[PDB]
Structures are given as structure tokens and as C-alpha cells.
Amino acid sequence: PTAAHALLSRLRDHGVGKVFGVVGREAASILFDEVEGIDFVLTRHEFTAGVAADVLARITGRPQACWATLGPGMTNLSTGIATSVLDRSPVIALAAQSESHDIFPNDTHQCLDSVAIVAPMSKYAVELQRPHEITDLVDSAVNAAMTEPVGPSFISLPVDLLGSSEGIDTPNPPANTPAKPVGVVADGWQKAADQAAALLAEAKHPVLVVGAAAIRSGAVPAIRALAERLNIPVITTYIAKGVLPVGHELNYGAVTGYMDGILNFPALQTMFAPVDLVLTVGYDYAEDLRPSMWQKGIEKKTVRISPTVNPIPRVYRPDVDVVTDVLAFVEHFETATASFGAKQRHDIEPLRARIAEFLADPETYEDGMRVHQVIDSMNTVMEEAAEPGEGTIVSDIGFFRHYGVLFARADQPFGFLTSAGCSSFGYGIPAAIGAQMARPDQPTFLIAGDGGFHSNSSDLETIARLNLPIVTVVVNNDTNGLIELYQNIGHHRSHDPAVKFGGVDFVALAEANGVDATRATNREELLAALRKGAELGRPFLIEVPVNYDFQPGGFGALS
Amino acid sequence: PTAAHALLSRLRDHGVGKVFGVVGREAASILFDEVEGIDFVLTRHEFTAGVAADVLARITGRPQACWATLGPGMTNLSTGIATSVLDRSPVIALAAQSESHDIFPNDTHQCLDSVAIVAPMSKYAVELQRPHEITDLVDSAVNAAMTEPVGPSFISLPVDLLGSSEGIDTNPPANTPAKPVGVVADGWQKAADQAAALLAEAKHPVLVVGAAAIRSGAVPAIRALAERLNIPVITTYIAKGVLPVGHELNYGAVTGYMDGILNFPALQTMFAPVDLVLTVGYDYAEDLRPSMWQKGIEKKTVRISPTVNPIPRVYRPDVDVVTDVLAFVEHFETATASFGAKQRHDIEPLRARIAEFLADPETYEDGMRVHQVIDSMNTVMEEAAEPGEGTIVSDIGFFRHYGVLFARADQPFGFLTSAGCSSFGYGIPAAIGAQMARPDQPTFLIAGDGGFHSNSSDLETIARLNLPIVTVVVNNDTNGLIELYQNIGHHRSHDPAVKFGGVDFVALAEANGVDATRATNREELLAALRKGAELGRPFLIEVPVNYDFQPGGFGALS
Amino acid sequence: PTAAHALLSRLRDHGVGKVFGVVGREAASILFDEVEGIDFVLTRHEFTAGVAADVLARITGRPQACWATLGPGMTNLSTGIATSVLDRSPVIALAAQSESHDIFPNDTHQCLDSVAIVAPMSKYAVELQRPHEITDLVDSAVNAAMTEPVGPSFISLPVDLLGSSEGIDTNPPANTPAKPVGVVADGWQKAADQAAALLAEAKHPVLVVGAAAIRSGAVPAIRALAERLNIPVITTYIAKGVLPVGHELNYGAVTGYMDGILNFPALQTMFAPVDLVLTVGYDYAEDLRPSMWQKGIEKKTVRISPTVNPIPRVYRPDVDVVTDVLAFVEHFETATASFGAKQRHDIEPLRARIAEFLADPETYEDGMRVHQVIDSMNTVMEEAAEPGEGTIVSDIGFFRHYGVLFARADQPFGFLTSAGCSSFGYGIPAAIGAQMARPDQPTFLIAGDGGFHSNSSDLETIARLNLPIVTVVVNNDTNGLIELYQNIGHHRSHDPAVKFGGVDFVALAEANGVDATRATNREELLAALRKGAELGRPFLIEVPVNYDFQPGGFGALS
Ligand SMILES: Cc1ncc(C[n+]2csc(CCOP(=O)(O)OP(=O)(O)O)c2C)c(N)n1
Ligand SMILES: Cc1ncc(C[n+]2csc(CCOP(=O)(O)OP(=O)(O)O)c2C)c(N)n1
Ligand SMILES: Cc1ncc(C[n+]2csc(CCOP(=O)(O)OP(=O)(O)O)c2C)c(N)n1
Ligand SMILES: [Mg+2]
Ligand SMILES: [Mg+2]
Ligand SMILES: [Mg+2]
DSSP: OOHHHHHHHHHHHTTOOEEEEOOOGGGGTOOSOSSTTOEEEEOSSHHHHHHHHHHHHHHHOSOEEEEEOTTHHHHHHHHHHHHHHHHTOOEEEEEEESOGGGOOTTTSTTOOOHHHHHGGGSSEEEEOOSGGGHHHHHHHHHHHHTBSSOOOEEEEEEHHHHTOOTTOOOOOOOOOOOSSOBEEEOTTHHHHHHHHHHHHHHOSSEEEEEOHHHHHTTOHHHHHHHHHHHTOOEEEOGGGTTSSOTTOTTEEEEOOTTHHHHHTSOHHHHHHTTOOEEEEETOOGGGOOOHHHHOOSSOOEEEEEESSOOSOTTTOOOSEEEESOHHHHHHHHHHHTTTOOOOOOOOOHHHHHHHHHHHHOOOOOSSSBOHHHHHHHHHHHHHHHSOTTOOEEEEOSSHHHHHHHHHOOOOSTTSEEOOSSSOOTTOHHHHHHHHHHHSTTSOEEEEEEHHHHHHTGGGHHHHHHHTOOOEEEEEEOSBOHHHHHHHHHHHSSOOGGGTBOOOOOHHHHHHHTTOEEEEOOSHHHHHHHHHHHHHSSSOEEEEEEBOOOOOGGGOGGGO | OOHHHHHHHHHHHTTOOEEEEOOOGGGGTOOSOSSTTOEEEEOSSHHHHHHHHHHHHHHHOSOEEEEEOTTHHHHHHHHHHHHHHHHTOOEEEEEEESOGGGOOTTTSTTOOOHHHHHGGGSSEEEEOOSGGGHHHHHHHHHHHHTBSSOOOEEEEEEHHHHTOOTTOOOOOOOOOOSSOBOOOOTTHHHHHHHHHHHHHHOSSEEEEEOHHHHHTTOHHHHHHHHHHHTOOEEEOSTTTTSSOTTOTTEEEEOOTTHHHHHTSOHHHHHHTTOOEEEEETOOGGGOOOHHHHOOSSOOEEEEEESSOOSOTTTOOOSEEEESOHHHHHHHHHHHTTTOOOOOOOOOHHHHHHHHHHHTOOOOOSSOBOHHHHHHHHHHHHHHHSOTTOOEEEEOSSHHHHHHHHHOOOOSTTSEEOOSSSOOTTOHHHHHHHHHHHSTTSOEEEEEEHHHHHHTGGGHHHHHHHTOOOEEEEEEOSBOHHHHHHHHHHHSSOOGGGTBOOOOOHHHHHHHTTOEEEEOOSHHHHHHHHHHHHTSSSOEEEEEEBOOOOOGGGOGGGO | OOHHHHHHHHHHHTTOOEEEEOOOGGGGTOOSOSSTTOEEEEOSSHHHHHHHHHHHHHHHOSOEEEEEOTTHHHHHHHHHHHHHHHHTOOEEEEEEESOGGGOOTTTSTTOOOHHHHHGGGSSEEEEOOSGGGHHHHHHHHHHHHTBSSOOOEEEEEEHHHHTOOTTOOOOOOOOOOSSOBEEEOTTHHHHHHHHHHHHHHOSSEEEEEOHHHHHTTOHHHHHHHHHHHTOOEEEOSTTTTSSOTTOTTEEEEOOTTHHHHHTSOHHHHHHTTOOEEEEETOOGGGOOOHHHHOOSSOOEEEEEESSOOSOTTTOOOSEEEESOHHHHHHHHHHHTTTOOOOOOOOOHHHHHHHHHHHTOOOOOSSSBOHHHHHHHHHHHHHHHSOTTOOEEEEOSSHHHHHHHHHOOOSSTTSEEOOSSSOOTTOHHHHHHHHHHHSTTSOEEEEEEHHHHHHTGGGHHHHHHHTOOOEEEEEEOSBOHHHHHHHHHHHSSOOGGGTBOOOOOHHHHHHHTTOEEEEOOSHHHHHHHHHHHHHSSSOEEEEEEBOOOOOGGGOGGGO
16 A cells, blocks of 8 residues: 555545556556546547646646656656646646666666756646655645646656555545635735726726636636626637627627738727726736737726736736736625726727628638638537537647637637647647546537647547547648748748648548548538537547638737 | 858758758748758657657767757657757757747746756756857857767747847857767776776676767777677667677677566576676666676676766776777777687577577467567568668667567667667657668668557658658557556556557558558568568558566566 | 946835945946935845845835845855745845856856856846846846745846946836735635634634734734633744733743753643644744644644645644735634633743743853843843833844743844744844834844854944944853754764854954943843943943753754
8 A cells, every 4th residue: 555545545635536648667656546536548648648637627627637657758748737837727747757766867767857847837846755745745736736827736756656655554634625726915905906996987998808817716707797787898818718608799709919910900909999998807928918919099007907916017017906816806896896887888890790701701712721611610510519608619729720719619618728828739639638528518629730730649549549529620731830921921931841741631540540530621511520520429530621821911910 | 141040050060951840930030941051850749850860960970950949849849858868969959939028937928948947958058148149059059969978958049039130240160079078087097907907807708888889989999809809799779780790799788678578587698607797888878787787696897988977876886987988998909909818608598599589480369479570670671781781760668678689780770769768759750860861771660559659640751751761560559568567566457557449550651641551470571571671662561469478577677 | 327227226116225235346337326215235244234134124024135246245145045035034135147148157257057046045036138127127026025925036137237228218116015915715714714613612722923923914913812812822933022021911932942941841831731723824934833832632723824835744734724814813803703702721830930040040150041141131121122112133042042932022023033044143134134124222132152253243334334232142162052962962062063262252342343341140241231222332242151951851852
């Protein structure tokens, strides 16, 4: 009865029922059957394990766990750890290490200084030294992971100590996992909130810019009630899409710095130009809705609300800074503004018309489909297949992703899932895995570009093996298209050796992995393939040839 | 004319003609056409780029370069960096970073503290701060990389500084070291003479040769020493081929798994009567450990390395000679010029056991056995290669230790695998690097289903570059090595940690534009190997295998 | 108009009027007259600068600043930074660095990797890279220093950039937090309520109060709670004085040395019948550890802190309230509003014992006893000081623990010592900081010969600033605490590790321009103290002492 047992048992005390990973030779010390109610989920690559855990933690709000072996195991996991640190999710990352008496980093076979490597990108990082302490290390790891900004905690596990029963006896203390993320709270935040209320009092066209920390705080219903009473528009970051329902009159959409260039439309100006008060509710610069994006048209005042002290005063100096829990802010604000009447909201119908026009695009293109037509087809079938307020569209990283941000349906919080802070290509499959496990009876669609999908396509076999009924659409232009865009922005020409691929047949790729698939080259074929996939009761992949036709000169907002 | 040009131009001065990588949004600052003579090689994942650079550097003995974007780019590359630090290769690893005025690690979009992450696994790690200094940073990175123990140097490149011409005026000589700079102790000559005196007294000495001897350029000299004094040469995994196949002093490679695989007292046969072990170019990371040769009688040891001993807790040689390996061997030649040849000890029972595995004529109900697969590969490699040429590459897994024991190596680095880092997925990138380094030689890759599929997407890269690599994927629907360890530790398995469903590697290969076939016995496999070797295009062969391992024979692993 | 001006002007925006330090060659880039309202305070050693800033910050509750040159300036300062990080104090530590283009750690003259060295002992550590950004770096430094656990932030300043005006134009509000930003867990009110229920069922609860309680502004509220429900108050070292001297609920301070010093079961008396320990503002660094209150019957514990518990291996409170201390007390007042007062437990045998030490009328054959020294200081402090005023500061050593038990404190931080870091030499800088923070109050310092002499040169600083600190040096020609530990460990002494020759601290003080005198008994000490306190100038009193300690009485020190 060993530290491996005490580890798994403590994870389970904190609510963990899955460990995602790839096990190495430390399997001599840990089987993963030692504790009832916690199971191992084997992936093809450690990145997939880390991202699956991150996303399951995002949707559940609870700590999750991933696992890798020593040396290159841990480095592979680290892109998953980086996802969690920048996207903000409470993940406990565990990795084996050389036997304790034999830890000579860069000299012992497969021995790296794991704590030193991972500490700069984590909330907490430690190496196990005395077997019975694994219980308290897991606790301190959860404590740090569950403190805003939420993130991963790392424990390195020498194989000998993992397999040792020394000092381990037969009654664990309470787990005490925080109910929601712990935050910081400034003395005088109430006064700061009252000052925000006095700015709202004077403002003609205020907006709420809502980030993910608002969702983690459990402040979505309260934010919606505030917005509906006062008629304040809600604009979101990528992953706060769906904090209001599709079709809500105050759902002004998500912002991406790519939107003007993709739409050939003055979208940032339409969204922000007449606004005089910006309330960034749960603001986090990592989500990449930056101040320069809303600094359009008239002079604005700003209110920051966050459970963290402002880490970027060089970039964002709010007029009023409210450092407190988002939900506590909103409840205090409701009281302070109870007597206020509703604003006249500003008009963004021209932007909505442009977006709708992209989605309805009936044209046939000689090349492949256009990504907006692809997403419109996914929206239609997602709306049919999901219960109201259910379903998840997942997006990998690429140019197409920002079409996702503009165009994808999101009918609940995290109804559109992508990596905002880290943005590693290959995110899509592990995120779909985590989303489908978190929402076992909801339809899960994934969209991925060819570049990023193939960076991590081997975990198609994991999808087959777990029998997760994800429907994947691969938009293929034999290019790292986003990168060709940047080549042209910077130098007004391409260089193919740095962005171009040959042909991959993703349909046949999927089927090699035991996932049924098909090709679709227009709206009719794509709708039929999506409807088949959604009813299949099994995973399904759809390859769609696309092209972009981008305007390099239209992307000045990215600077 | 920017820091992007000055960077590429400086890599070029140091002999670099290729940069492997995946380019991100730093493409706005660097195109990779700025300098004639340097081409970008685009991979599917940054790990492949790092490993291909590592292997190219190992075979050429010259610094090579790899490239990633900021954030997750850099962390993906880091497994490649880890490969180069533990396997010892001079790689210049480069990665973009957020704009300089906007570097707030873990707060800015995609922004990680790259230097802090990479420093503990590199020789040198720095962030560019003033554009014109990129030239001297590349020089300092080459310097630290080409100092033993050789390894990767890292430079982080803010996108704005990378695309800037501030302070760049329109170059000093490069002075690239021809071989790695080494550590030399005062009095190493005296230590070398004490080593000669132990050799005089010893009846059955052995030379245990590591890759550092190859880097030093000491292969012919070691061979002439060994031949004159009749001293057996035993190698690490990648020092296989320092003697030709069939040379009588070629006593084979060592691996900790050899007794369990052979079901034979192989370490005791190799080492029991030996009274003096000379570890020439010793490196613990290669995983030929002291406990493996400490069989039978007590032995004296001589360590020879261009580094100070980092592991006195594990290895305390009787004589420690800290110097360049070639310098040691030339001094030792003089000190031993008058010695009589030794009576070398007998390992024929081990040789017969290995030969018997290679000639195994049984048909199993399962699939093939891995020793039969490699026998077939050795046969075809000998047909297709000129003498002293050809590379067999191995990915990581249980099958890899069969490669150590059984795979043909007819030159230095004729059998390539990752000994220090041993990341699964190594195979494809290592075969790419190997084939580019030896453009007219046959390159065969053996990989397991577990590791192969961890990095199988760069099959497309092989098709795109049209490198005629022949890959054999030995598939048991399992992380086999790991099931073995489950059984060593607990005398049973647990499938959810090691078992996969079916992957059709034949169809996977063809999805990527690589012709492929399935082979289930020797006849089919020999034909597929011969078709692939003469194809003039990449080819893949999936072979079903099983291991049927005996957990109790693997005590040397602890 | 330069980054030096911008740095000082921004410190001034955050309320800073003094910068303590030693200036090196960066004086070519900063004079310290660029901004009216900020004066430089030159010390003899950088440790003194850091501690003075630390103590000024503790008493004022506002961020303070210290300064050192590159290289050894910065390493000398770092013991001050460590003081601030372990004692919890908001200090902005500033150190110069080599010119930016010439930063090569361990190669350039006086060039150390300052940020890497200080980062592990600070809230925030950064190197200036673009002159105009010094404004936002100061803000980020203040932000991180004024977040619990409060501590120091470090900015390294390359001398070229410090002296550059590039990008500085001729200003946003500073927004300095009035009290520390704290961590608050969702549900803390439910945990508070669960603590109220424990209080209801408890017969003998106690409040154990640490310094975080004082930073929160929670002293009046804690006093009102304790008096209404008749709950005794026990303190850490620097939380002495949260109740006036004489108050019936003032159960004194705890030190792990108290049993050995008093030769009495003091911890047993304090805690044996207690059934509920509320550690209000708990911080393990202060060194009141759970093993100290774990005496007699089983106890339940409530932790209240504006931090998540960093030490669950050592302390697992039955109820953990993570919130601001004042907020806790105010919610706790409400939940317990209708509760009946408790019967407080009896510790008169401990009070009687402490009072016995203070009144000890014997004149000993060798030196005075430290309890007699402190009794004398207490008597004169009470005469010299207005009610609720005065500070006694203690350096580190065996005598310091007599300070903890015996020294009078009639206000919060009326007894100051370093509880977290406990560097010897602390006394002088702490008294400088204390006297400057309380310019019209008497400030007495007690230090031992070992610690005092470790930092005695800053006597010149006290003379130069004309701060009327009265210092008492208790001299036994020994690092006495350490001789204690030699005996605890091995039951004997080893003099080469602990014994000094004679130092005439009277003559040493007068060499620095500070009047002084020797006192060897109560009469002489009282006369010297009363003179010192009315002198209007610094004064130093040397007292010979001895301990005659009993090694077996100190088992609580585990
Ligand atoms: C690990 C990693 N390396 C590099 C990048 C830069 N990058 C972002 S997305 C992407 C893929 C873009 O190609 P694709 O998925 O096909 O989408 P497309 O732009 O063609 O629409 C790349 C290379 C990245 N995001 N992550
Ligand atoms: C990055 C990384 N993660 C985990 C491991 C542990 N490990 C080593 S080899 C290997 C693959 C073993 O399976 P396979 O390639 O099929 O070879 P087999 O043992 O079945 O012959 C694994 C998972 C590893 N080497 N590298
Ligand atoms: C910087 C530092 N080094 C060493 C110590 C260990 N130590 C603590 S106090 C102290 C001084 C003890 O001597 P003294 O000041 O004369 O007081 P005494 O114990 O004699 O009463 C020493 C050496 C320390 N506290 N700080
Ligand atoms: Mg693409
Ligand atoms: Mg296998
Ligand atoms: Mg003393």
C-alpha cells in the first residue's frame, strides 16, 4: 500500500475520476487500478492528455489530472501545461522522474530538471521527496491551481518513491477543494464599484466586455440579469461566447482583432465607436481582447473588474479598477444601480447584417468551399441535434478559427471552445475529447484546419477507442494559412517552403484510425455529412477543401 | 535588411544550409528566403524539426538549426531540445517571442518565459534585446553548443526585434570548431600512464566505446589500438559500427534488457572474466551503467572523457582521464607500443545465442517476432548498401532493444536511436536527418505502433521531401515496453494504461502519400523491403508482432 | 529629464519620502535630488537600508524604498530583502546593474544575474529595459508588494537606462492601496459561521493573534470581541501590545524557548485546558507553531488569514477562513452577538512566574540577568513614554526571547523584532526605522554582543541622523544562543564556534559619535536609561550579562 495508492486516493478525494496521459516505465510503481473510482485515459501523445484535462476542468469548474513519464514525457506534457497556464484551468500535472538517489539532470538517462523547466509556466511545482507527503503536495497543488489566475500545478514523482510504502499508514484529512476559484480582493473595492456605478449613471452607451473569469466566478445569470434590466450590450472574448443565448438582443457577439480584415467591414468601429463606458468584467489580457481593439471613435472611460491585481498597467490603465470576485462585484453593482433605468443601447445592425450575409453566402466557388459556409452548415446541424442551451462547437487554431469566433453558434457558456491564451495547434481533438466527456449526452462538433489537425491527428485513435461521438470537420487548403497571411502582411508576398504542404487524405487518415469519414465539397454534401455524423452514435470525420482569398492590407488591427 | 537576415546569414557562416521547423506569426518578420544557401524545412510538429536537426548535427559533426513560434511552438520544440541535450548534439534552437515591449509571461497572449523554461535543458539560453547583437548571440550559442558535453543552445527572438533593421550596417570570421571543444585536466598524461600500467597487468581488458569517441574523431585510432593489442570493443547503442560487422573484436552493444530478451546470462558472458574495463568517451546518459559490467570478478576501471565526472556517486573509476578521446588514444598508443597482445575472453555462447535469434525459422500463430523482422531488415540492407554504408534507425520501445542486439551497423552511427532522451516518435525525424546527411545511402526505420503513431503525421513530410526512407512499423496494439514494466512491478497488466485499438498503418501511410504494404512472414517482409529499397520513393511496411515476455529475467534494469 | 527622475517621481506618487541605501557608480546617472519630497538616507551597509525600509513600512503601513549598487551592493541588500519577505513588509528594493549592452553575468565586472538571485525571495523581480517603462514597473512592484503575503519587489536598473531620457515625455494616478490586497475564498462566511458554532460549544477558547491582524486594521475589533466574550488573547512576538499592558485578557506572547527560560511548564499552563484555538492572522513564519499549543486536552482550530494555507503538512485547521482579518472579525461579531461570555482559564501561576523574573532583586556575582535588564528598560520606557506609545526593539539572540516574554508593549508593534527572518544585526536598522516612523516617541533597542557587532558600524548613521535611540548591548562575549544549541545537541560547548574576545562597546559607540556608558547592575542601568531617554541624542549602554542556561529545558524547540 504505496505512495501510488495515496496519490490516486488523494486525487479522488478532490473529485478526480479520470487521469489522462501516457504511462512510462513508472508503471512498475503505479498500475492505475489501485483506487476504485479513478480511471486512466490513455492518449497517443501527452499534449492531448494535458489539453483534455484542461478542458474538462474548464467545463466542470473542478481540478483534473494528467500524467506523463520522465524526461521527454514531461516536456511533451508541458505544452498541455502551457495551455492550462495561459487558458486558465486548474490542472494537476503529474510526471515521473528518475529514482531519487539517481537524479542528475542532463546526465542520468532521461533525467531532466522537471521542476526547474515547469516552474515558470505553473502555479506550483515540486518534486516528491518523502512518500507519505504526496497527500499534502496534492493539496497544495490543488490550492495553487484553484487560485486566480487558475492554472496548472506540477508534481515530479521519482519512480522509487512512487513505489514506496515507507511512512504510509491506514484516515485522510478533509480535501477542502475550494468551491470556486479563490481570488484577491482589494480593501476599498466597494468604493471602487460605487465609482463604476457613478460612471454608468452618466454614460450614454456603456458595454459589458465579459471574459472567462466571469464564468468561473458563477456570475453568468447575474450578469445577464444586470444587462437585461439596464439594456447594456454584452460583448465577449472567444471563450465567453454563449454567456447570452443565440438571438438575445444584447448578444453583440465576440471580438477578434482579425474581424475587420475577415469581414472587409469597419466592425471594431461599429462595435465600439459610440461607446463611452467599457466595463471589462473578468478581464484577462491573455484572452487577447486588448484595449487597442475598443479604443475606437469617442473617448471612453474604463472599469476593470478582476479577482487579480492588474499585471499589465503598461497596456491597460483602467479609470476604475475593482479587484474583487466577479460575482461579488455584480451583486454589489445591482444594489448600487437598483434605482437606475435602462440605457439606449448603440446600434450594431450593420455589423449583424454583414455577419449574416457571410453566413448565408449562396455562391459556388471554383476552388473549394469558404469557411463561413462551412460554419453556417455546422450551426444548422448543431441547432437541430442539440437540446436548447446545449452542444459544443470546438475549434483548433488557424485562420479558420477566427471565422469560428465570428460565426460559430454558442448557446451556452463554453458552447464555443477554443484556446485563447495559448493557442497551440492540435488543440481541437483533445478539447473535443474533454468537452464530450464533460457533456456526455450533448453533440460535440470540432472544426480544424489541415495544418493544426495533422499536428495532432493520431489521437483520432483515442476518439475511436473511447467511442466519443465527436463530429470533426477538417477544412483543408494544404497550407498553414494563418502563416501565409502573416507572410503577406509583413512582406507583401508568400514563401511556400515555410507554409505549404502536399496532399493528405484526411478521410482515409480517419479510417486508418477506425473513424468513419467522408468528403464534402459544397453545402448540400456538408449538411448531409453533418446530419449523418450527428446521428451515427460513433465518431465521424468530414474533409472539406477550402480557400480563403484574404486581403493582407486589411489586418492593421493586429499590430 | 533586418535581424532576420543577419541571423540567417550568420547561421550560413557557420555552415548551416537548412533550418527545420514550423513558422508562426513571426513570418511577418522572417520569410526564410533572405539568404541564399539556407532553406527552410517545414515539418508537421516542432519535435520532428528538433530531432531532425539533432541527428543531422550528429552525423555531419556540424551545428544545425531548428525553429518554432512563440509559446506552444517553443514548448513543442523543447522535447527536441531535450533530445539534443541528453543525446549530445550541437543544435541552435530558435523561437519567436512576443514583441519586446509586450513580454509579460503568462499574461500576454502566447507568451511564456522561454529562457527560464529552456535554460535547465540547454548549454546556453538568451533573449534577443538589440537587433544587431543577433550575430554575437549566434556565435555564443555555437560556442556553448560545441563544448563538451555538446548540446543545444537557445535564442528567443521578439517578433519586433527580429523584423527590425535598427543598428544593422551593411561580418567577422565565424571560427566554427571542426570538432567539439573539450575539458582537459592538468596531469591527464600521468593518469593515462597509470591506465597503461593497468592494461599491462590485465589479462582480459575491454574497450567500452561511447559516441563521444566518435565525435572526437577517434574511431580509426581506437580500432588500430584494439587490433594491435587484441582488445575487444563493446559499444553503447549508437557506437554500434565503430568496428565493421564481422570484425572479430566487435563484441556487440550492451543494453540492460539483453538478458531478458535473450533469456540468457549475456551480461555475465560479456563481462565476467574481464579484469579491466576502459570506458572510452564515457557518458552515463547513454545508459551503459556500471552495474551492467560489474559481473563476475572484480574489475579495475579507466574513465576517459572530455568532461569532469558528473556522477561520482555511481561511477568512481580507478583512473579518471579527463581529456580529448583522440588525444588519449594517441598518448596511450605511445605508452603501450611495446606491450604484447592480450588473450581476449570468450563470448561465443552469446554470439551463438544472438545468431540463433536472428535465424529463428518458427512461424508463430500471433504475428512475427521482432528478431525475425530485424534479420530480414539486415539481409536487405546489406544488399542495398555499399560496404560501410546504410543507416538503420530505431524509434523507442521494447523492439528498440532488439535493434541494439540484432541490427546491422557497418559504419559509425549506422544504427541510430535516441539513447539519452529516448522520446517515442524519434524515428521519423531521425530517419529524415539520416537520409539528408547520407543522401545516396539506404535509410531504414523500425518503429513500434505506440511511438510511431505518437509522431506519424510527419509521414507527409517524408513524402513532400521525397526521402526514400523505408519504414517498418511493428504493431502489437500496445505500449509493449510499458506492459513489461507493469509485469516487472506487479506481476500483472492493466490494459487501460497500455492498450490501443487497431490502427491500419498501411492505410495511414497512403493517406499521407507514402506507398505501403502489410507483411506477416519472412517471405512477404523480404519482398516488401526489396520493393521499398529500389522504389526511389518512401515506403512503409506494417508487420504484426507479439513479444511474449518473461518479467523475471529483467533484474538488470533495477 | 531622465528615468532617474521618473523613478523617484513615481515613488513619490506612492507616498515615499525616503530612500535608504548605499549609492555606487550609478551616482553618475542618479543624484537623488531630482525630485523634491524624497531624501536619500545613507547607511554604512545595505542590510541596514533594507531593514529600515522594512520597519518603516511595517509601522506606517505604506510602501518604502531601499537602494544599492550592482553586484555586491545587491547581494548585501538581499539580506534586507529576505527580512522583508519573511517578516512580511512592502519594500521596493532597487539596485543598479551593468550597462544594458554589457550585461554578462559572472563575466562583466560587478555583474550578477540580479533578477535570478532575488526572484526566489521576492514578490516581483524585473530588469528595466526601456527607460519610460520605469513608471509601470514601479506600479507593478507596489501592486505585488502590497498583496498578501506582503513583501518586497525588486527592480534592477542598468546605469545607462537609469540615466537615459529616451521616450520620457513631459502622468497617471498611482492608486496606492491603503491596506494590503488580500486573498478571499468563496464561502468564507460559511467557514466563519462554522467557527462561531465551535466557539459556542467551547469552554476555554483563546485568540492567538499574529501581525497580519494588525495590518488588517483589526486590533480595536479583536479587543472588543475578546472583552465581550471574555476570550484571552495570546500573541506572536510582534503582535505584543494588541491589548494594553495590564489588561486581564493579555495572556502574553508565546516563544518556543519560554519553558527553558522560565524553568516552568509555561506552554502547559497557557494551553492545556484550552479546547479551541483561533489563530487570527496566522503565519507560520512568525514561528508560533501548532506543536506549541498542542498541550493537554484535544483542541479544535480555526485558521484566519488573507492567504491560502501554505503548510497543510504542518497545520490542518478544523476550520479554515481565508479572508481579510477585519472582515472576519466583523462577520464573527454578528454571528456571536447573542453568545454568553466564557469562563477564561487560569494562568496566574505563569503570570506570577514572569513577574518573579522581572522583580528578581539579587545582584549576581558575574553579569546581570537579561530579565533584570528588561525590567529596567520597561520601568524607564513607561516613565519616558506617553500612554499607548514607545517602542522597544530587539535584535536576535537568546536575549531576544527574554524580550518576547518580558518586554513591555503598550501599542501594536510596541515590541519589534524580526520573527520571520531573524538576521542578527537587525536592531540598529529596526530602531532607525521605528524612530523615524514615531519621531516623538522613545525608542529603546536591546541587542547582544554577537548580533550588535555584526552591524555596529551603522552607529555612525544614528549619530548623523541624530535619532535619539537608547541602545542597550547585553554582552557575554558569546553567540550565546548558539552555545545553547551546541549543548542541546551534544551536551557540551565548542568555543571556537561561538566565543569572542572582548569588545568595548562604550568606546565603540563613542568612536562613532554616540555617547555611551557601562552599567553592571539595576541602579546603574536605571540611571543610564533615564539619562539616555532625556538626552535628546542617541545613547548606548553596555551591560555585561550571563545566562547560565539549562539545556534539558528546551525540548519544545523540535
Ligand atoms: C504549436 C504551434 N506551432 C505553430 C503555430 C502557428 N500556427 C497557428 S495555427 C497554425 C496552423 C494553421 O494552419 P491550419 O490549421 O491549416 O489553419 P488555416 O490557417 O490553414 O486556416 C500554425 C502553424 C501554432 N499555433 N502552434
Ligand atoms: C514522449 C514519451 N512518452 C512515453 C514514453 C514511454 N514509452 C517509451 S517507448 C514507448 C512506446 C512503446 O510502444 P511501441 O512503440 O509500440 O513499442 P513496443 O514496446 O510495443 O515494442 C512509450 C510509451 C516515451 N518513451 N516517450
Ligand atoms: C545573519 C545571521 N547569522 C547567524 C545567526 C545565528 N545567530 C542568531 S542570533 C545570533 C547572535 C547571538 O549572539 P548575541 O547577539 O550575543 O545574543 P546572545 O545569544 O549571546 O544572547 C547568531 C549568531 C543569525 N541569527 N543571523
Ligand atoms: Mg490550412
Ligand atoms: Mg507496440
Ligand atoms: Mg552574546
